[PDB]
Amino acid sequence: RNDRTLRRMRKVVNIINAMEPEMEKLSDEELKGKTAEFRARLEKGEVLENLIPEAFAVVREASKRVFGMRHFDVQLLGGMVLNERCIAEMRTGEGKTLTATLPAYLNALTGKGVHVVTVNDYLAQRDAENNRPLFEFLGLTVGINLPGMPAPAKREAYAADITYGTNNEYGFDYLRDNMAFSPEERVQRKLHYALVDEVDSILIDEARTPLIISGPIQNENQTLASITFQNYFRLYEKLAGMTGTADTEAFEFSSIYKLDTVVVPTNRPMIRKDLPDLVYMTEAEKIQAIIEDIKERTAKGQPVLVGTISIEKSELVSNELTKAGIKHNVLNAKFHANEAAIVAQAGYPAAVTIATNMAGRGTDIVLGGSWQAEVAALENPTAEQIEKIKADWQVRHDAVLEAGGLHIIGTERHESRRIDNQLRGRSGRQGDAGSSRFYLSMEDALMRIFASDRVSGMMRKLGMKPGEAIEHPWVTKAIANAQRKVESRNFDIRKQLLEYDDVANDQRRAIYSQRNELLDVSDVSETINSIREDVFKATIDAYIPPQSLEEMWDIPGLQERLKNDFDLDLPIAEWLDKEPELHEETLRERILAQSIEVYQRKEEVVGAEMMRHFEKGVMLQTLDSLWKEHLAAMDYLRQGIHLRGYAQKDPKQEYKRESFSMFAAMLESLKYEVISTLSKVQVRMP
Amino acid sequence: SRNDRTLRRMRKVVNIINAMEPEMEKLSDEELKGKTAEFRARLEKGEVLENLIPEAFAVVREASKRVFGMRHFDVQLLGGMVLNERCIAEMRTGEGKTLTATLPAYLNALTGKGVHVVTVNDYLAQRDAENNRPLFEFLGLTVGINLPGMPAPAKREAYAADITYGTNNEYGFDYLRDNMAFSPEERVQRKLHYALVDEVDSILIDEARTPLIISGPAEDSVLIEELLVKEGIMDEGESLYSPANIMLMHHVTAAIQNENQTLASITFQNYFRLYEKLAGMTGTADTEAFEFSSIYKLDTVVVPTNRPMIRKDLPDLVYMTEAEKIQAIIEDIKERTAKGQPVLVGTISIEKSELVSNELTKAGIKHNVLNAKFHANEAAIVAQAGYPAAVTIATNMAGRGTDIVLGGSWQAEVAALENPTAEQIEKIKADWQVRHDAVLEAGGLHIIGTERHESRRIDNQLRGRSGRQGDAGSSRFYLSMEDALMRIFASDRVSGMMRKLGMKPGEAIEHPWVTKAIANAQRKVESRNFDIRKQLLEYDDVANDQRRAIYSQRNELLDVSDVSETINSIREDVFKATIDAYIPPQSLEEMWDIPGLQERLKNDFDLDLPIAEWLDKEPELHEETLRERILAQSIEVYQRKEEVVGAEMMRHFEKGVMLQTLDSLWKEHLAAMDYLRQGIHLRGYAQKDPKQEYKRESFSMFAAMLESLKYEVISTLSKVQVR
């Protein structure tokens, strides 16, 4: 794995670097033309991966010219990771959005499309509009998909070389496409490449979330179509994504998706100092130590950001900082404008900011303050007002760097380390000096994830002693270990649930493959003919046990069932009693033959083409109704998973059997109902 | 007349202040600073504060010029003069409230009694304090800041400054804790002189009845007939359901280490009514003038805008169905965005934001939704919201918010540049001025309210985001017969008469009365809801009255070094009534109960005076002379304790006893009233006025508690042990 495929990638980066001179010499129009050239080579059978060096050099030069921005080498590496079935972990500040332009371009060349998957519609629109000038420079088109967009505009978006949209809207389009009655109605093309912008939410937290299209004595209403996010993304030929050195869930990615994760090295060395966790007997002693840390550091001019787990915890450290005479600001979620004013100068010398359940990624904190806010505040910004301001700011920035950068204090750990990782990640971005320290007490909720009141209370025998602490780095490890076992416990449970999910996934995958085979064809004849014989054979068998005497036959039952279910009223009793020659095999053939002549007759009235399309129609409609019905029954079967499979024998397993049985039965019903409808369809006969 | 007549006399004063501007310009920084001492000299000689307004305002306006580079506008002078009276200054968003407020703050600081600028939160307190501190120091005044957790000496410094900034909450809590002090030097506040409240909608109206509570563990240690019989403390003929036995009853409604109790309580409404002067500000966010006047006796003056307010507030429109409303909304947005006008759409819910947003996309219309989950996206959106043909959807958009700058802010574009130069900015700024002017000429910012709120204040807040500082602008509210709003006309039939004024497919008309009917309905809802609230304030006035009386008493104690004569007075009071019980005034010697008297005396006062044995050696002395001597003995046993302890110690012990007994009986009372108030949710009946009976029982227990305060003080001072 590893730096084993990373050192192979570094070799390609040195080829890209070595090519910059060639690219710098090309005209704007020659750069555009590289796209057609790459496509001409692919046409001739070139392997996409062979184009990475030249293609990435093109994209980097186009970005130089268009954006004023040149991918760094580690940006090239990330782009290479994202071409593979991988998660590329790239630290916050590393420029993920720019990095992503690379495998987007690369994977657009074969003419099959690219789906960049964003967390919300604002980002989809933004990233598409921002990148559109880059990709147009290189002779590519950019599409945007939004909820509510009419189907023709959706088709256009999906017909672009690169599409932007949310996870939700891609998934719903897929479902709606598998409710279409003609292939022209579809909006998406074949699912080629999904590049997922933040995989933690999109791929992990939402993995099992169902997308559902719902629809109609009451009427009441019900599921017509369903798929989970996981099973949606599993449909792509190529799948990849990005997240920050966050992750903690590499094993999940692989288990849920067969996505490998790759640590992309930072552009600059990471130098933030993550100091050992500190543990106190009580909250009160914990708070005093936090206050004492703040005090020492603000006196050196170092700014501090404190993350807490609640408003009540935020109030408490505030009030205690005030008692101690230390100025600060609390980020109050009620006051968004105050909050952005505070965050802007959070990197200012000796600044102290308290934040509550600090979200994830966050607004960049500029060391020394943002000078940019300073001019945005000017009534009439000159250019030389804006120089005294940078010069003053430089001194501040460099002084804060000197004092150790941003210090992060976690006043509690969260049960998930990924959240702790996000808080800490707000310091030390882009090579910046920084530090972090997390605080625990024995009356912290988290001192519970060691499932034992004796265990944890031994820490009290280390005594702690009010300001006379030591640091025991084994504690840091011990806590990270406890947090990894919680994640693991939780995932073993999720995994069992996904193994139930895999039954419905396989069923849907089967039914949808069948539906689409039907949708893609103009003429469903061979199938019709073919299931008619199955249906008639099955139907006759119910009344004529195969290879049985005539005395076992229920001909009145067979006569009625043909009338009732097939509109087919045959003098079978009179047939038998007239020719002693008959026999089962020839009877079976007469009936089949008559159903046919009667059907061919209806066709002669309406016309072949009308008939063919009615047949297709009927197949699709009957498939859909039995599938909605199956989805509901699968639901009930699954919630009933507390009384059918028990003593020794596995549930999962009995459920798999019942499921298989019910899906088999559904496919046999499907055949029956189609032929029943087609046999019964009333045509006014001349 | 009313507001017109105030504004006229105030405009005359503005003309005076403006005439003074050249004197003030010619003054040195130091001469300006000296103006404060010169106003103070005059006030000390009997000048009336309001006579100082013209000179004072001129001085602050000149100093703001030198210090901030900001010169108060004439409308800002007017609002400053409104704020000197018991009034709310309604000043539109974008009018510079925060600068206006320096004026009455300066002036109300001159008598040396303090100013409490009240802010909504601690960020604003600190920020305002720090931003004004150079202005007020330039004028020889000090500025303090009060925050939760600040130590008491620091608090005292803040309250001792000429002007203080802090939140409502912290002012109140400080008041409560000052009334738990056992010496006057422990107090952090001064006498409550002037409170200038920065946003009165939230602080004065929404939070009027919010109680501030100090709690401390600081407490100490047919059905009925069954319970009533057995045990005692009530034992003879009293009724467990009496107010009196309320706590006992609670123990049996209740029936093991501590619990905790209210030690002190005030509502915001009652805290701000303690000030000698109260004033505040809010945006054209009125509708609540009657409430301010009702609850606080604050009058409201609508201050005019610096530039003419030309926003066009267009007639409400009413559609049959929600779906018909939404289509009209989309076509409005369409015609407007095609002329280059930007639009802001305010909705009441997320789902309502998604429906409009989704139909905008079905219509081909680019927009942004303000998604409450992505606040960084949201502030990027608000930035370009005044850009040409921009469309933004906001959900329950709160009061006030950020100025949307027509054209975008050019200054923001430039704050992207790592390296601006002169002709760059210039490109940016001139490019902007073209967009800005094009947006003005397309009609400025249009506001669509897709539904009206039950509260009109809120709709006015929304509409108020357009037409700031004289920009062109417009607003249109949309309604449906389906709208939750067409409901609070409390008849279904008396709404339905626009089935039959029945709004046809393509076309349109307009009705002035519909707009006025809707407004008038929102106004009946408001007055209906304030009727209910006034009832609750009536309950609150019972507590306020009692707490005002007991804290007045507590403070008189706190403020006196020697309480002797209060003690001497109440001891006679107490001994007189205690003896009355057994000896009916002027009664025959045979009208007298001693097996009952002697006992109480020993039991309640450690006073054991073999009484009938006197009256056996002296058959002659008579009732006044014996009342005289019982008093005398109690006094005598007391002075000996005092010559053991020393007058100083004894005097201060008496005061501590009074204070501590008062606080104890007071806390008991607060808890018993709490119970009565919720006992009086269903202690009984759709019937005999529940309120009223609670007022009576509460005032009766209050009166009772005043008499126990005496008795228990004297009993404590009688029984105290010195060896």
- Candidate CATH numbers 3.40.50.300, 3.40.80.10, 3.10.450.50, 3.90.76.10; the one for domain B308-511: 3.40.50.300
Separation between Cα atoms, residue B54 and residue B17, nearest integer Å? 5
Nearest 5 degrees, angle CA A426-CA A427-CA A432? 135
Q: Calculate the alpha carbon distances from A522 to A526, B33, B40, B158, B308 in Å.
A: 12, 93, 98, 86, 69
User: Do the Cβ atoms of B24 and B59 come closer than 8 Å?
Assistant: yes
Separation between Cα atoms, residue B157 and residue B165, nearest integer Å? 12
Q: Collapse the DSSP code of B118 into the 3-class scheme (helix H, G, I; strand E, B; otherwise coil) and give the result.
A: strand
- Which chain B residues are within 8 Å of A378, Cβ to Cβ? 411
The answer to the question of whether A364 is labelled as a binding residue is yes
- Which chain B residues are within 8 Å of A92, Cβ to Cβ? none
* Cα–Cα nearest to B145, from A255, B279, B133: B133
Which stretches of A465-607 are DSSP H helices? 473-519, 525-541, 555-566, 572-578, 584-606
Provide the b/e sequence for B492-507 (b: ≥16 CB within 10 Å).
eeebeebeeeebeeee
CATH 1.10.3060.10, domain B512-723, yes or no: yes
Q: B123: nearest CA in chain A? A: A329
Q: Which residue has the tokens 């031994």?
A: A458
Closest-CA distance of chain B to residue A675, Å: 40
Closest-CA distance of chain B to residue A126, Å: 10
The helix (run of H) or strand (run of E) holding residue A295 is helix A283-299
Q: Calculate the alpha carbon distances from A405 to A94, A295, A374, A410, A462 in Å.
A: 18, 15, 21, 16, 32
User: Do the Cβ atoms of A23 and A62 come closer than 8 Å?
Assistant: no
Q: Calculate the alpha carbon distances from A572 to A559, A560, A562, A676, B402 in Å.
A: 7, 11, 11, 19, 85
Separation between Cα atoms, residue A70 and residue A52, nearest integer Å? 16
Q: Which residue has the tokens 């050696």?
A: B617
Q: What is the 3-state secondary structure (H, E, C) of B416-472?
A: CCCCCCHHHHHHHHHHHHHHHHHHHHCCCEEEEECCCCCCHHHHHHHHCCCCHHHCC
Q: Collapse the DSSP code of A122 into the 3-class scheme (helix H, G, I; strand E, B; otherwise coil) and give the result.
A: helix
- Which chain A residues are within 8 Å of B380, Cβ to Cβ? 122
User: Do the Cβ atoms of A500 and A655 come closer than 8 Å?
Assistant: yes
Structure tokens at A614: 């009615």
**CATH homologous superfamily for B222-252?**
Protein translocase subunit SecA, preprotein binding domain (1.20.890.70)
Separation between Cα atoms, residue A202 and residue A124, nearest integer Å? 14
Nearest by CB to B422, from A120, A373, A383: name it.
A383
B430: left (phi over 0), alpha (psi -120 to 50) or beta: alpha
Positive or negative torsion for Cα A330, A331, A332, A335: positive
The answer to the question of whether B98 is labelled as a binding residue is yes
Q: DSSP letters of B378-405?
A: HHHHHHGGGSTT-EEEEES--SS-PPPP
* Cα–Cα nearest to A179, from A503, A515, A663: A515
User: Do the Cβ atoms of B388 and B370 come closer than 8 Å?
Assistant: no
What length is written for chain B?
723
The answer to the question of whether A222 is labelled as a binding residue is no
Q: Which residue has the tokens 């209906």?
A: B528
Closest-CA distance of chain B to residue A364, Å: 11
> Radius of gyration over alpha carbons of chain A, in Å?
34
* Cα–Cα nearest to B440, from B414, B468, B460, B419: B468
Structure tokens at B451: 């539904």
User: Is there a contact between A120 and B374 if contact means CB atoms under 8 Å apart?
Assistant: yes
What single letter denotes the amino acid at residue B5?
A: R
The helix (run of H) or strand (run of E) holding residue B615 is helix B611-617
What length is written for chain A?
686
User: Is there a contact between B374 and A150 if contact means CB atoms under 8 Å apart?
Assistant: no
Q: B420: nearest CA in chain A? A: A383
Separation between Cα atoms, residue A643 and residue A147, nearest integer Å? 42
Closest-CA distance of chain B to residue A369, Å: 14
Nearest by CB to A332, from B123, B150, B360: name it.
B123
- Candidate CATH numbers 3.40.50.300, 1.20.1260.10, 3.30.930.10, 3.40.50.9100; the one for domain A1-268: 3.40.50.300
Q: B369: nearest CA in chain A? A: A122
Q: A364: nearest CA in chain B? A: B376
Domain boundaries, chain A: 1-268, 269-686
- Which chain A residues are within 8 Å of B188, Cβ to Cβ? none
Q: What is the 3-state secondary structure (H, E, C) of B305-347?
A: CCCCCCCEECCCEEECCHHHHHHHHHHHHHHHHCCCCCEEEEE
* Cα–Cα nearest to A519, from A177, A136, A279, A258: A177
Q: How many other C-beta atoms are found inside a 10 Å radius of the C-beta of residue B587?
A: 11
Q: How far apart are the first and last CA of chain B?
A: 76
Cβ contacts of B677 within 8 Å, gap of 6 or more: B539, B694
State the burial class of residue B243 (Cβ atoms within 10 Å of its Cβ: 0-12, 13-18, 19+).
buried
Q: What is the 3-state secondary structure (H, E, C) of B150-186?
A: CCHHHHHHHHHCCEEEEEHHHHHHHHHHHCCCCCHHH
* Cα–Cα nearest to A233, from A262, A261, A200, A196: A196
β-pairing, B211-216 vs B261-267, is antiparallel
Which stretches of A352-451 are DSSP H helices? 371-377, 385-402, 417-424
User: Do the Cβ atoms of A76 and A52 come closer than 8 Å?
Assistant: no
Positive or negative torsion for Cα B580, B581, B585, B589: negative
Asked whether the domain spanning B222-252 has the same topology as the one spanning B1-217+266-307, the reply is no
- Report resolution in angstroms: 2.0
Cβ contacts of A191 within 8 Å, gap of 6 or more: A115, A174, A235, A236, A237
Q: Calculate the alpha carbon distances from A213 to A175, A177, A221, A683 in Å.
A: 8, 12, 11, 34
Rounded to 10 degrees, what is the CA torsion of B58, B62, B63, B68?
A: 130
Q: DSSP letters of A58-104?
A: HHHHHHHHHHS----HHHHHHHHHHHSSEEEE--TTS-HHHHHHHHH
Q: B383: nearest CA in chain A? A: A376
Nearest by CB to A375, from B362, B375, B414: name it.
B414
Separation between Cα atoms, residue A422 and residue A426, nearest integer Å? 7
Closest-CA distance of chain A to residue B169, Å: 14
Separation between Cα atoms, residue A622 and residue A667, nearest integer Å? 11
The answer to the question of whether A165 is labelled as a binding residue is no
Separation between Cα atoms, residue A630 and residue A514, nearest integer Å? 15
The answer to the question of whether A136 is labelled as a binding residue is no
Name the phi and psi angles at A400, rounded to 5: -65, -40
Name the phi and psi angles at B44, rounded to 5: -65, -30
Q: Collapse the DSSP code of A196 into the 3-class scheme (helix H, G, I; strand E, B; otherwise coil) and give the result.
A: strand
β-sheet bridge partners, residue B88: B280, B300
Positive or negative torsion for Cα B526, B527, B529, B535: positive
> Radius of gyration over alpha carbons of chain B, in Å?
34
Rounded to 10 degrees, what is the CA torsion of A250, A256, A258, A264?
A: -30
Q: Calculate the alpha carbon distances from B631 to B241, B559, B620, B654 in Å.
A: 37, 28, 19, 18
Q: How far is CA A215 from the centre of its chain?
A: 25
Q: Which residue has the tokens 């404008």?
A: A337
User: Is there a contact between A378 and B402 if contact means CB atoms under 8 Å apart?
Assistant: no
Cβ contacts of A303 within 8 Å, gap of 6 or more: A346, A347, A348, A349, A350, A351, A352, A353, A365, A367, A400, A406, A407
Separation between Cα atoms, residue B35 and residue B29, nearest integer Å? 10
Cβ contacts of B584 within 8 Å, gap of 6 or more: B591, B592
Q: How was this structure determined?
A: X-ray
Separation between Cα atoms, residue B229 and residue B242, nearest integer Å? 15
For chain B, the maximum distance between any two Cα atoms, rounded to a whole number of angstroms, is 116
User: Is there a contact between B149 and A125 if contact means CB atoms under 8 Å apart?
Assistant: no
User: Is there a contact between B126 and A327 if contact means CB atoms under 8 Å apart?
Assistant: yes
Nearest by CB to A336, from B361, B375, B420: name it.
B375
Structure tokens at A103: 């495998």
Q: How many CA atoms lie within 13 A of B252 on its CB side?
A: 13
- Which chain A residues are within 8 Å of B361, Cβ to Cβ? 146-149
User: Do the Cβ atoms of A369 and A359 come closer than 8 Å?
Assistant: no
Q: Which residue has the tokens 């869930």?
A: A249
Q: How many CA atoms lie within 13 A of B226 on its CB side?
A: 3
Write down the CATH number for the domain with range B1-217+266-307: 3.40.50.300
Rounded to 10 degrees, what is the CA torsion of B171, B175, B180, B184?
A: 110
What single letter denotes the amino acid at residue B170?
A: E
User: Do the Cβ atoms of B595 and B583 come closer than 8 Å?
Assistant: no
β-sheet bridge partners, residue B90: B282, B302
Q: How many other C-beta atoms are found inside a 10 Å radius of the C-beta of residue A470?
A: 10
What single letter denotes the amino acid at residue A402?
A: E
Mutation for A interface: B93, B130, B147, most A CBs within 10 A: B147
The helix (run of H) or strand (run of E) holding residue A441 is strand A434-441
Q: After which residues is chain A broken (C to N over 2.5 A)?
A: 216
What single letter denotes the amino acid at residue A393?
A: W
The answer to the question of whether B35 is labelled as a binding residue is no
Nearest by CB to B123, from A335, A372, A384: name it.
A335
A contact set with B (CB within 8 A):
120-123, 125, 146-150, 153, 315, 318-323, 325, 327, 329-330, 332, 334-342, 363, 372-373, 375-379, 381-384, 386
Mutation for B interface: A336, A345, A365, most B CBs within 10 A: A336
What single letter denotes the amino acid at residue A59?
A: V
Q: Which residue has the tokens 């003929």?
A: B237
Mutation for B interface: A154, A342, A386, most B CBs within 10 A: A386
User: Do the Cβ atoms of B677 and B539 come closer than 8 Å?
Assistant: yes
Name the phi and psi angles at B700, rounded to 5: -70, -45
Structure tokens at A658: 């019942």
β-sheet bridge partners, residue B474: B312, B446
Separation between Cα atoms, residue B395 and residue B345, nearest integer Å? 8
Mutation for B interface: A322, A393, A426, most B CBs within 10 A: A322
The answer to the question of whether A95 is labelled as a binding residue is yes
Structure tokens at A571: 């003098």
CB contacts < 8 A (A, B)? 99
β-sheet bridge partners, residue A305: A353, A408
Nearest by CB to A338, from B123, B371, B411: name it.
B123
- Which chain B residues are within 8 Å of A149, Cβ to Cβ? 361-362
Separation between Cα atoms, residue A552 and residue A546, nearest integer Å? 10
User: Do the Cβ atoms of B249 and B255 come closer than 8 Å?
Assistant: no
Separation between Cα atoms, residue A375 and residue B502, nearest integer Å? 55
What single letter denotes the amino acid at residue A102?
A: L
Separation between Cα atoms, residue B285 and residue B262, nearest integer Å? 36
- Which chain B residues are within 8 Å of A327, Cβ to Cβ? 126
Separation between Cα atoms, residue B702 and residue B688, nearest integer Å? 22
What single DSSP character describes residue A245?
Answer: T
User: Is there a contact between B123 and A342 if contact means CB atoms under 8 Å apart?
Assistant: yes
β-pairing, B143-145 vs B163-167, is parallel
Separation between Cα atoms, residue B351 and residue A516, nearest integer Å? 34
* Cα–Cα nearest to A146, from B392, B326, B358: B358
- Which chain A residues are within 8 Å of B416, Cβ to Cβ? 372
Rounded to 10 degrees, what is the CA torsion of B414, B415, B421, B422?
A: 50
Separation between Cα atoms, residue A527 and residue A671, nearest integer Å? 10
Structure tokens at A492: 């073993």
What single letter denotes the amino acid at residue A682?
A: Q
Provide the b/e sequence for A233-259 (b: ≥16 CB within 10 Å).
bbebebbbbbbbbbbbbeebbeebbeb
Beta strand segments in A259-326, E: 260-263, 273-274, 278-280, 304-308
Q: Calculate the alpha carbon distances from B642 to A124, B413, B567, B639 in Å.
A: 85, 80, 14, 5
Q: A382: nearest CA in chain B? A: B422
* Cα–Cα nearest to A302, from A193, A204, A436: A436
